[PDB]
């Protein structure tokens, strides 16, 4: 993991004065990053965006011998509020460094979401740190919240922040700026032309080991079967083949796959646009000094960057409205996209009705604007990066070492834009059939494990998709038994609506508590009688037993599913648990839950 050259050096170098660190995960503080070290030009001064994880940042300790210099941290909370992936060698730093940060100036936006236990963790520890190492904060630490929306909170954080940046530097506020300029290859060879493939040329094709996120494995489709029983929603198991990849998984781990998006929205916005998606070309930063030469894989035609490398699905960001504004001939609807990037008024209001409610994407957005004809080679340096979609692991590696197992739902809903919306990675996956069925993936590995001795009893709360890792827990402690390991007691809480609807893996599962593998299987059918019935109802039944697990066996408890709702009642059930067989008041029953649910016991998402 080779660091870049010092990043003051650079900006010595370029002539910057600002530059903007993103935290990410998929994407998002990236975004705000670049939309920040542009917005640094129309105010006198120069930025870059860096990823923390090429710099070595005790170099911030060397920022002060640049003049009106300024540092902005953009970072995502992760996991259990850890940092991002690409942010952990930093958040290992501000642990162990004691350097002196005298006469750095900083300022950090925060990305989280309130329905998580640890709201904005990372935000505000690095805001803290800089401080304790003698740093002086520029501005206010922004809490950006996902829960509500995030877009806003960066609009209301970014209006102050920038005022309050030239009123302490003293410079002044001063046009559709690009970033990328189009080249078209007329003679051009189809073995120089990228297709889909994220890191070097050919690396799909030409398969070679190590795999990770840059060089992801093409896993051939053995298995897609119909879990649900009904016909209401779409559950599938996959199955994709990591034979000779030399991937390492354990149960509790994740899988991380690059989809493509359908074949007919891209058409059509080929269509909608008059473009020609079979040109071939690249877009070159106009910054020869950056090493982002792309904004993805060149040279390719727009119809591989707008089905592999762009997303084209979800709502539009501010930025992007505004930066389209301009292509729009009728003057309402230029004013309308133009107001979109408002903090507050009518357009802020439109912004959040008419795009991010209704869920228009790009394409609803080209049909119920019809005045707005951009071109597409600034419409694909506009447009984000398409992401990985992350699925928990569905096998154990000790029982399906060459197959990594995928439980999904299909997301397919009718929005208020009256358009019906496909998930793009579900509607995808969805497709594959068992050349062979390929599915660029690759593993992350995560803390979310079964306990280290077999004698430590399990207690999974996993109702709908939520079992996804519990399948691979419970294929693991089967396996255990019959190689003559002693093996605590195992109890899955699992929910659906109906037994006859959408019970998970009911076949599979049966058999795992015949053959005393599950030592409880205690299913919750939300919808088989006028009332609900949830797993938290099933874990206060079993509470006089639960406790016993926990406080007298050392019972690792583990959470998988929706984090909005469903992990709440589940905590708070577990909490009215521990006050009555403490006992103990509600104050010391929630310090007990929370010690008991240390990283690696919530595997959350929404
Ligand atoms: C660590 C982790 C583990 C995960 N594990 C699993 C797993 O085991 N199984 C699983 O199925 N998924 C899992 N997911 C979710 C998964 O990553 C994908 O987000 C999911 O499959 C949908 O991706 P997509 O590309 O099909 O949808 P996208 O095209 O990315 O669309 C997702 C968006 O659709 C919108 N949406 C969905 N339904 C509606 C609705 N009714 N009304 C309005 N908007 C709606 C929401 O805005 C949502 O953010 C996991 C996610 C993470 C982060
Ligand atoms: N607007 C949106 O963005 C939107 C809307 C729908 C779904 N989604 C997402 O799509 C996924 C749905 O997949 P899924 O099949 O796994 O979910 P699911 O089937 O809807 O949920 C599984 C089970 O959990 C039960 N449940 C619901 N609320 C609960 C609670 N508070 N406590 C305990 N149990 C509860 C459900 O009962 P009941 O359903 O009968 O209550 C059901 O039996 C989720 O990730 C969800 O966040 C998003
Ligand atoms: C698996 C997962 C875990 C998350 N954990 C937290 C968390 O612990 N605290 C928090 O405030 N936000 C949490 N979030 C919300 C994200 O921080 C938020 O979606 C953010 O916008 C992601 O930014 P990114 O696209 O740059 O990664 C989590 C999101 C996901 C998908």
Sequence with gaps: PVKESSFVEKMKKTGRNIIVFYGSQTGTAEEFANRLSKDAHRYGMRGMSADPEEYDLADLSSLPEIDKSLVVFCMATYGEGDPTDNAQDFYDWLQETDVDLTGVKFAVFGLGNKTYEHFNAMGKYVDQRLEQLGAQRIFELGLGDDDGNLEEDFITWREQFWPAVCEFFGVEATSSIRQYELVVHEDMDVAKVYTGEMGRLKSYENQKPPFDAKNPFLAAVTANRKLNQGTERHLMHLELDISDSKIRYESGDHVAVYPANDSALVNQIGEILGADLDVIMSLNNLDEESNKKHPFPCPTTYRTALTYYLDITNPPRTNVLYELAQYASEPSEQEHLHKMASSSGEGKELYLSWVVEARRHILAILQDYPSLRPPIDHLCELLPRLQARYYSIASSSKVHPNSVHICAVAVEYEAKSGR???????????????????????????????????????????????????????????????????????????????????????????????????????????????????????????????????????????????????????????????????????????????????????????
């Design 420 to 606: 019906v919306n496909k998930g793009v990675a579900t509607s995808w996956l969805r497709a594959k059939e068992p050349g062979r069925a390929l599915v660029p993936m690759f593993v992350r590995k995560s803390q979310f494990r079964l306990p280290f001795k077999s004698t430590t009893p399990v207690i999974m709360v996993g109702p709908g998709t939520g079992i996804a890792p519990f399948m691979g827990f419970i294929q693991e402690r089967a396996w255990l038994r019959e190689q003559g390991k002693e093996v605590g007691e195992t109890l899955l809480y699992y929910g659906c609506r109906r037994s006859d609807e959408d019970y998970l893996y009911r076949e599979e599962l049966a058999r795992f508590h015949k053959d005393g593998a599950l030592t409880q299987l205690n299913v919750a059918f939300s919808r088989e009688q006028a009332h609900k019935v949830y797993v938290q109802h099933l874990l206060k039944r079993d509470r006089e037993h639960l406790w016993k697990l926990i406080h007298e066996g050392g019972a690792h408890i583990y959470v998988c599913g929706d984090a909005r709702n469903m992990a709440k009642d589940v905590q708070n059930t577990f909490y009215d648990i521990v006050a009555e067989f403490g006992p103990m008041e509600h104050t010391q029953a929630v310090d007990y839950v929370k010690k008991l649910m240390t990283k690696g016991r919530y595997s959350l998402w929404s």
